[PDB]
Amino acid sequence: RSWRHLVCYLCFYGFMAQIRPGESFITPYLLGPDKNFTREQVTNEITPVLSYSYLAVLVPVFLLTDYLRYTPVLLLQGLSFVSVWLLLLLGHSVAHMQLMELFYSVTMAARIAYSSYIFSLVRPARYQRVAGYSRAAVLLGVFTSSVLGQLLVTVGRVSFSTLNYISLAFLTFSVVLALFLKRPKRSLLARMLRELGDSLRRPQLRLWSLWWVFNSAGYYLVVYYVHILWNEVDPTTNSARVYNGAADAASTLLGAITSFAAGFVKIRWARWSKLLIAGVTATQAGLVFLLAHTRHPSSIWLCYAAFVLFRGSYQFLVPIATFQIASSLSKELCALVFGVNTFFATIVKTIITFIVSDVRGLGLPVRKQFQLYSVYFLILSIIYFLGAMLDGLRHCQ
Q: SS3 for 235?
A: coil
Q: How far apart are CA 361 and CA 383, in angstroms?
A: 28
Binding residues for folate: 26-27, 101, 111, 142, 219-220, 224, 311, 315
Do 324 and 270 form a contact (C-beta atoms < 8 A)? yes
Binding residues: 26-27, 101, 111-112, 115, 127, 135, 142, 219-220, 224, 259, 311, 315, 319, 322, 331, 334, 338
Q: How far apart are CA 285 and CA 149, in angstroms?
A: 30
C-alpha 233, offset from chain centre? 23
Q: How far apart are CA 177 and CA 188, in angstroms?
A: 25
Q: How far apart are CA 58 and CA 109, in angstroms?
A: 6
Binding residues for 2',3'-cGAMP: 111-112, 115, 127, 135, 220, 259, 315, 319, 322, 331, 334, 338
| Terminal alpha carbon distance of the chain | 62
Please note each residue after which the chain is broken, C-to-N distance over 2.5 A, or write none.
188
What method was applied to determine this entry? cryo-EM
| Environment class of 287 (CB within 10 Å of its CB; exposed 0-12, middle 13-18, buried 19+) | buried
Domain ranges of the chain: 1-184, 189-397
DSSP 351-377: HHHHHHTSTTTT---HHHHHHHHHHHH
Q: What is the CATH number of domain 1-184?
A: 1.20.1250.20
DSSP 261-328: HHHHTTTTTSS--HHHHHHHHHHHHHHHHHHHH---GGGHHHHHHHHHHHHHHHHHHHHHHHHHHHHH
Q: How far apart are CA 379 and CA 352, in angstroms?
A: 15
Do 106 and 80 form a contact (C-beta atoms < 8 A)? yes
Q: How many H-runs (helices) and E-runs (strands) does the chain carry? A: 16, 0
CA angle, 66 then 67 then 73, to 5°: 65
| Alpha-helix runs per DSSP H in 91-187 | 94-109, 113-121, 127-156, 160-180
Resolution in A: 3.8
1-184 against 189-397: fold identical = yes
- Return all residues near 208 (Cβ < 8 A) that are at least 6 apart: 273, 321, 324, 325
Q: How far apart are CA 216 and CA 235, in angstroms?
A: 30
Q: SS3 for 45?
A: helix
| Environment class of 203 (CB within 10 Å of its CB; exposed 0-12, middle 13-18, buried 19+) | exposed
Closest CA to 291 of 230, 358, 200, 238: 230
Q: Which fold has domain 189-397?
A: Growth Hormone; Chain: A; (1.20.1250)
Q: How far apart are CA 42 and CA 359, in angstroms?
A: 12
C-alpha 133, offset from chain centre? 21
* Alpha-carbon separation of residue 355 from 215, 258, 330, 361, 363 (angstroms): 17, 34, 38, 6, 8
* Alpha-carbon separation of residue 325 from 191, 201, 202, 207, 318 (angstroms): 19, 13, 10, 10, 11
Do 71 and 117 form a contact (C-beta atoms < 8 A)? yes
Closest CA to 10 of 169, 129, 125, 144: 129
